Paper text:
Calreticulin (CRT) is a 46 kDa soluble multifunctional protein that was initially identified as an endoplasmic reticulum (ER) chaperone for monoglycosylated proteins and is also involved in Ca2+ regulation. Similar to its ER membrane homologue calnexin (CNX) ectodomain, CRT is composed of a globular domain, into which a flexible arm-like P (proline-rich) domain is inserted.
During this process, EhCRT is exported from the ER to the phagolysosomal cupule, where it favours the phagocytosis process in a way similar to that described for human CRT on the surface of macrophages during the clearance of apoptotic cells.
Numbering used by the authors:
A (entry chain B), B (entry chain A): 14 to 207, 289 to 359
The structure:
Amino acid sequence: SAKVYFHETFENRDKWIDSTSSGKALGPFKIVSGKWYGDANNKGLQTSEDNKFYIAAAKLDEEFSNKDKNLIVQYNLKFEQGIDCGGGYIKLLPKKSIESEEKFTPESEYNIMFGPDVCGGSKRTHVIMNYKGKNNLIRKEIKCESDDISHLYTLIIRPNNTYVVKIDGVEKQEGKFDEDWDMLAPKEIDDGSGIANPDYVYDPELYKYDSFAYIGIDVWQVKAGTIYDDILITDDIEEAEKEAKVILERNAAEKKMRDEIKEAE
Amino acid sequence: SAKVYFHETFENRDKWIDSTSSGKALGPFKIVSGKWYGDANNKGLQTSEDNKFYIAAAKLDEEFSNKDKNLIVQYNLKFEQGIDCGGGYIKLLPKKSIESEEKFTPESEYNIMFGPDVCGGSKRTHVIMNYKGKNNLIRKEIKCESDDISHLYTLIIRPNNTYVVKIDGVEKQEGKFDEDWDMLAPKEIDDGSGIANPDYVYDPELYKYDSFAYIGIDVWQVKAGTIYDDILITDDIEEAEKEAKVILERNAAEKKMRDEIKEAE
Ligand SMILES: [Ca+2]
Ligand SMILES: [Ca+2]
Ligand SMILES: [Cl-]
Ligand SMILES: [Cl-]
C-alpha cells in the first residue's frame, strides 16, 4: 500500500556525500546526539563549524514521480545553537540534475526547496517550486521557528494542484499552486511584466515533477549547530501522519530535557 | 506645507505618451466617462481593445526623492469590464532608465510597481520594490478587488523603513521592508541560494529612492476596459487622506449608479 521513498534517521551519514564540485570552503557534518533530545538512542546530522557552507546530497531509495499521486515531505529540524543566520532547508532534485551525489551544487537544478531559513529579521519557511526553468517563491509568508528545540516541517502536495504546509502537525497554509505562486508569470521578476500576461495559461500539473532522485542540503551557517533529525518522503498521507506523532512525541520529551539543562545553567 | 508631486485627474491624456520602444503590439487608450460614474464631468483613462498591451508614460510635476521624507501613492482604479486577466498597476521611475516618456517599456528600470493585477485565480495588489537592480515581490499576499466598481489603492512609505497598504481607505497590510521582502538575498531566486548567506546585511534605506521622475502604465489586457480614474503622489499623509475622502464619495455615487444600471438588466 504505502510507499516510503525515503526515511533518514541519521543513525549514520553513509548515504550522504559532501559536494566535491562547489567552489567552497565547506564545513564538516557530524552525527551528534544533541544537547537535548527525546530519545538517547536517537541521532541526527549537525553542522559543526561556524561561518561555512554545508552541501551534501543523498540518493533516494527509489526514483519516482508524484504524477497522479500524493506526496508528503516531512523532516524534523533543530536550531540547537540559537540560530542567528543560517539555513535549515532541504532541496529535492531530479535524476537529470546531478550525475551523482558529489556533483551537487547550489546551482544544481531542484524540483522543490522547502524548510526554515533564518537571518536577521527574516524567519521563513521556504516552499520554492521549480517551474519551466524558474524557482518560484511561495508568494505567501510562512514564518519558521527560531528557538532551540526541534520542530517538524510538513509539506503536502495533492494532484488536485494544491498544497498544505504544517509545522508540528498544525496546518499553517493551504491554497492552490496557480493562485499562491506566480509560476505562470515567468518574466515578472526580470522583465518588469505583470502577472496578467500572454502565456498565463492554467497548468493542471504545477504540482507534478517527472523525476525525484536526490535529496540535498546546502545551507550557509554563521552559528553552526543546526541538526537535521529525521527526514521522511512518502506518497501516503496517513503514513506521514503516522510517523509525525512519533516524532512530535519525542520532541515533547526533547523539550522536557531542554528545560532542565537551562536551570542547571 | 504639503508637497504634491503629481495629481492627474484625466480631463485629458496629454502628458501621457504611448511607448514607441516596447517590442509589443499596443492598443489605444481612450478618455471615457465609464458605464457608471460619480460625476459626469470627471473622466478616466481606459484600455479599449482586447488582447493588447497598454503602455504609456508621463512626467511628474517635479523630480524628487523620498529620502528622510514621507511618500504616498494613491490612485483609483476600476475593472468595469468584469476583468478576467489584466493589470492593474502603475510604475514609478527614476530620471535615468528612460531618456523620455516614449522610451518607457516593461523592461525599464523602475523604483516601485504598485496596484491590482488579476489573471485567473491570481488576484493581488502588487508592492514590487526595486533594490540593487532587481525587482522584489512583497512576499506576503495582498489580495486586490476584482469587481466592477472603482477602488482606491493607497501605499505609504515612511523613512522608518516601513510601509502600509490600504484599499478604499482601510489598512490591509502593514510591515517592515527588511522582514516582509527578501531584498537582502538578491541571488535567492536565481543561483539556488537561501536567505541566510554571507552577504545579508541590514539596510536602513530599503525605502529610499534617489530619483522619482516618470510614472507609467504597461499592462496586458485580455478583456480591456480598465479605467484609471485619479492618480495622486505626495509627501504628506494628511492631504492624501484629505483627497481620499472626495474620491471615496465619488465612488459611492458611482456605486449607486451602477446597481441602478444592472437592475435594468
Ligand atoms: Ca532521527
Ligand atoms: Ca479623474
Ligand atoms: Cl519560499
Ligand atoms: Cl508583488
